[PDB]
Amino acid sequence: LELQEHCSLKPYNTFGIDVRARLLAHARDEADVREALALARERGLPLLVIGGGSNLLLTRDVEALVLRMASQGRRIVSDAADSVLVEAEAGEAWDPFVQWSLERGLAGLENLSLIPGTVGAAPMQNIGAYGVELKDVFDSLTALDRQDGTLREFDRQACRFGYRDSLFKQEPDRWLILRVRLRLTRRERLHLDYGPVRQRLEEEGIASPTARDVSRVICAIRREKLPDPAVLGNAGSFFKNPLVDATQAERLRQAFPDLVGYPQADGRLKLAAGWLIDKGGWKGFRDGPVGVHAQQALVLVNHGGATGAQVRALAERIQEDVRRRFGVELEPEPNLY
Ligand SMILES: Cc1cc2nc3c(=O)[nH]c(=O)nc-3n(C[C@H](O)[C@H](O)[C@H](O)COP(=O)(O)OP(=O)(O)OC[C@H]3O[C@@H](n4cnc5c(N)ncnc54)[C@H](O)[C@@H]3O)c2cc1C
Ligand SMILES: Cc1c(C(=O)O)nnn1-c1ccccc1
């Protein structure tokens, strides 16, 4: 299991936080997962599952057995003409899996290109970008129940997907996702509702655009605008876009005409969290080794040497400010440990 004791978790989380783990193992299959669980239980330790550590905020030393999911495997399950069921192990890296799918001529994942992390973590966070969510293509997953060790399958309804949310993120220590099945397509019409994606695609003058073509535009836009943790530690968008009811939206828009929002089918309004934080004065904020990115106001950053506690406290500060100022509470996207 390539076990290490008292090992630093710095290279395993995109914020670059330097806490240390009491044990660190690497699981390459389901037997390893079972061995790691028994080992944690035999030794009186909790078990902390990690993938690419790109949605984790570590705030203290980890008195647990940290299990890095590193199982490999990607395959086509059934090809049903336009629809195609594909399957990947939890440890498979997400963006190489998107590229694997497009190289097979399958559409569906192109708008989720270049998101960090693993296939296993993607349903838990219901990852989303440029108008697409994982739940749009989700068929099923296999998860180990950590209350009794049994395996069960979840279809889409049983996953209780929501905005950057799922049953698994609500009960975080309960299920351990082993493999994920998605339904991809061929020859479908192509999701270009986002202005800048459509504009840059059109500028390229492809006679007949495809999913691969969309994927290369999204990669270029993401590389252009989103800080890379390689250089500046972060977990992407720290906050979710909040939803408010129609009355709250009336008082806010009647007080701020410039309010950026996305109307929903049920009459509620999803506010742009980045606009709230910018309009609150936080963009470019910096206090000691932590701050808010100068152009992407949603992105909290580790300039170097931050503890996880300092990141946590800046976020709580931004939260309190935006609550006090516009009466809106910003929820975080990252998971806190
Ligand atoms: C630069 C950057 C850009 C990003 N852009 C986006 C974006 O556009 N859209 C978006 O939605 N997200 C985005 N994210 C965050 C996104 O959630 C992660 O990139 C990714 O989904 C997390 O996967 P991971 O494997 O890194 O999970 P980790 O951070 O390792 O884990 C996160 C949580 O999920 C759990 N988890 C991981 N694997 C398993 C498993 N097999 N079983 C059970 N629990 C598990 C962990 O226990 C932890 O609670 C971004 C992050 C970064 C750093
Ligand atoms: C573009 C984007 C989306 C989206 O397009 O919905 N979600 N997060 N995110 C993001 C934002 C800042 C940093 C990293 C990722």
Specify whether 224 is catalytic: no
Ligand found nearest the CA of 297: 2
Q: Which residues contact 261 (CB under 8 A, 6 or more apart)?
A: 249, 253, 269, 270, 271, 272
Ligand 1 neighbours, Cβ below 6 Å, are: 14, 49-56, 69, 90, 115-118, 120-122, 124-125, 127-129, 164, 172, 176-177, 226, 229, 234-236, 335
Q: Is 197 in the pocket of ligand 2 (CB under 6 A)?
A: no
Structure tokens at 28: 């390459």
By the 10 Å C-beta count (0-12 exposed, 13-18 middle, 19+ buried), 176 is classed as buried
Domain residue limits, the chain: 1-72, 73-226, 227-337
| CA separation for the pair 17, 291 (Å, rounded) | 14
How many CA within 13 A on the CB side of residue 18?
3
The rounded Å distance from CA 110 to ligand 1 centre is 18
Ligand found nearest the CA of 233: 1
Among residues 25, 120, 100, 26, which one has the least CA distance to residue 64? Answer: 25
290-292 β-sheet, strand order: 286-287, 290-292, 300-302
Q: Is 128 in the pocket of ligand 2 (CB under 6 A)?
A: yes
| CA separation for the pair 265, 240 (Å, rounded) | 19
Counting every residue written for the chain, the total comes to: 337
Q: Are the CB atoms for 132 and 78 separated by under 8 Å?
A: no
Pairing label, strands 4-8, 56-57: unpaired
Q: Are the CB atoms for 35 and 52 separated by under 8 Å?
A: no
Specify whether 237 is catalytic: yes
Phi, psi angles (nearest 5°) of residue 176: -120, 110
| CA separation for the pair 277, 120 (Å, rounded) | 31
The rounded Å distance from CA 39 to ligand 2 centre is 37
Measured CA distances, 132 to 82, 109, 128, 141, 302 (Å): 19, 8, 5, 19, 28
The rounded Å distance from CA 176 to ligand 1 centre is 14
Q: Long-range contact list for 267-270, CB < 8 A, 24+ apart?
A: 268/243, 268/244, 269/243, 269/244, 270/163, 270/241, 270/242, 270/243
The rounded Å distance from CA 54 to ligand 1 centre is 5
Phi, psi angles (nearest 5°) of residue 241: -65, 120
Q: Solved by what technique?
A: X-ray
